[PDB]
Amino acid sequence: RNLKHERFQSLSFPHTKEMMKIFHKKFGLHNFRTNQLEAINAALLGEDCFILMPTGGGKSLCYQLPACVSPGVTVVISPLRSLIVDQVQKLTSLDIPATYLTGDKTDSEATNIYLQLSKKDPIIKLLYVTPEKICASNRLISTLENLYERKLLARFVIDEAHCVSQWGHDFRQDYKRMNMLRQKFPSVPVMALTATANPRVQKDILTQLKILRPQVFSMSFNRHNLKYYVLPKKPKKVAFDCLEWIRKHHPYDSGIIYCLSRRECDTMADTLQRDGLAALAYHAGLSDSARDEVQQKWINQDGCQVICATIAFGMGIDKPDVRFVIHASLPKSVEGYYQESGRAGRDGEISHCLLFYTYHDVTRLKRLIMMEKDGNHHTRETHFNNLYSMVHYCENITECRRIQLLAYFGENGFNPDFCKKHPDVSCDNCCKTKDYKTRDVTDDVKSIVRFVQEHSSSGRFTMNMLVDIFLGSKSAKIQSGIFGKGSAYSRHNAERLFKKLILDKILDEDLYINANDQAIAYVMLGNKAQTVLNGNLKVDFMETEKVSQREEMVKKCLGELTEVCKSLGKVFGVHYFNIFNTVTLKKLAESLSSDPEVLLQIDGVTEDKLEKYGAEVISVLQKYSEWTS
DNA sequence: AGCGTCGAGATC
DNA sequence: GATCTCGACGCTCTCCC
Ligand SMILES: Nc1ncnc2c1ncn2[C@@H]1O[C@H](COP(=O)(O)OP(=O)(O)O)[C@@H](O)[C@H]1O
Ligand SMILES: [Zn+2]
């Protein structure tokens, strides 16, 4: 399914002259990434395009570049004004005419937009818009209708297209009403983009939007620049480990910490602030005035380094230079973990994804499923399925996590040499230095299964009890059926081995509620236990035991350049990263050159940007002129 | 009633 | 010095918009 659009890879096309002209001089880029040239060409031939790329893939270019090289205006549908504002700010920073009708623009300002569009001489190529605006306001419609007639409606871009699927992680009703846009404007090319790896959703997007035979541009959803860590969660020193970790690796960079509840966010946020870390809580419990102040401070890096957010609310804001993302608890599913931690490092620079794990968090999350009241169906059983798939990600400490994540989406092709060919972004499992031998413990398992069967006739021994008992400890509750046999086993391997008999469907768990809300998991038996007792299924387990002077100047240079962007930001009324992105800055500093003939040969440096932001930047770069050796 | 935490003492 | 064990003591949160 990962096709090759050999037809669209040619530079022989008529538009190719002007397109490359805008690609080099307006955007300032030099080389296309995977499926970029193919997707761009296709869009410019009037084809219905469907873009599937992971975060940071390069989805923005697939519609932003065609709009610049097209008669008329491209109409882009986005789900949030926050996303819209960020993209328009990036575009206006390149002197590319664009604006938006989100709804919080007063009718007077709104009308000024409709004016520039009506002249039929519009200089504006990109018009971002929210879905309820199209649905509710028939004022917008009467404008578009005029553009269609003069053949100036270039195409309908549908950003975040996964919002149309009820099977998607972010469903929106107004996206269902997008089919009415194609009905009135059938001649107009439609383009859908998404960063969803879930194929069942990818398929559903096409079915719901009723796009007739599109060009499907797929890609490997492996996140090339994310370091995946799983770490042992000693509860109650999460904040300390986060504080310690952040200060060690990324003391002066923004990040996110995801917590299950609004309260735990406040708690996490509180602990960090009083120790001198710029942390704020972020969730739906905040007043609207508060919410706006948080995102002001976090996005612009003005008095807030870290937000402590609930998953639902954390999706609502973003910045491209998020250097780390920490999950304080255990995510509900692997797709969820992937999309959540995936939003780190959109700017393509290395970023870290830390999951704090303990199996205790499982029983908590297990009870949440039982409680909630939309209806206890055998679909909510699947919420349990996803959960088990998540634990597997955490318990698997040998197989490359990149393979594990992609395997969950069923991605085929990925080379397991990646972490080895790319040491700088290796995951923890491939980071783990030593080897381990797998042994057969069927003998040991039989005794165990027998033990549980005897005292169950729900359950009467939790995992901890069972481990203490089988470890031959002195905290053990009963020294009868298997006391002292896992004497060989450490309390690390004894633990994991017990975590692996609840993952092979060998021992299920009991969810008794307590004399209080925190539920306990008594151990029972798992269906497959007899296929083991039959003399059939075999079991296996795997016991687990200076800077140089020029390099010093680029650091100093890069330091000043960042603040200059921050200042230019407040002046031009724009986020600091919509001036120069992190990669642009990093390459500028490493040249130490003031020669514009060398600077324009760097990604992100354009004639316009080096003209209205140049003077301030070149001044700083002049100081290091005597170092460009 | 289970469960981390954590100081004191065993063990390497 | 660093990791383990024991066992007394203290806290346990139907989540998210
Ligand atoms: N082909 C490319 N060449 C150079 N830089 C690129 C390219 N594509 C994207 N980028 C850079 O990557 C950053 C984010 O890419 P973006 O298109 O926003 O990814 P996505 O839209 O998938 O989130 C942008 O700041 C842009 O400068
Ligand atoms: Zn790996």
Residue numbers in the entry: 637 to 1093, 1106 to 1193, 1207 to 1290
Per the authors:
Bloom's syndrome helicase (BLM), like all RecQ-family helicases, acts as a 3′ to 5′ helicase on a wide variety of DNA substrates including forked duplexes, G quadruplexes, 4-way junctions and displacement loops (D loops). It forms a multi protein complex with human topoisomerase IIIα, RMI1 (11) and RMI2 (12), termed the ‘dissolvasome’, which can promote the convergent branch migration and decatenation of double Holliday junction intermediates formed during homologous recombination. The BLM protein is a 1417 amino acid, 159-kDa polypeptide with multiple structural domains. At its centre (residues 639–1290) is a catalytic core conserved amongst RecQ-family helicases.
In order to gain insight into the mode of BLM DNA binding we have determined the crystal structure of BLM, in the absence of a nanobody, but in complex with ADP and two different DNA oligonucleotides, containing 12 bp of duplex DNA with either a 5 or a 12 nucleotide 3′ overhang. The best diffraction (3.5-Å resolution) was obtained for BLM DNA crystals with the 5 nucleotide overhang (complex I); crystals containing a 12 nucleotide overhang (complex II) diffracted less well (4.5-Å resolution). Clear electron density can be observed in complex I for the entire length of the DNA, the duplex region of which is positioned between the D2 domain, the Zn2+ binding domain and the WH domain. The majority of the contacts to the duplex DNA are formed via the WH domain, which contacts DNA primarily via the N-terminus of the second helix and the extended loop between the second and third helices, forming an approximately equal number of polar contacts to each strand. In BLM the DNA duplex is almost perpendicular to the 3′ overhang, whilst in the HsRECQ1 DNA complex it is almost parallel. The positioning of the dsDNA also allows an interaction with a region outside the WH domain: a lysine/proline-rich loop (residues 868PKKPKK873) that connects the first β-strand to the first α-helix of the D2 domain. The five bases of the 3′ overhang stretch from immediately after the β-hairpin and pass close to the helical hairpin of the Zn2+ binding domain to contact the D2 domain. The first three bases on the 3′ overhang are flipped out, pointing in the opposite direction to their predecessors, in a manner that resembles the flipped bases in the SF1 helicase PcrA.
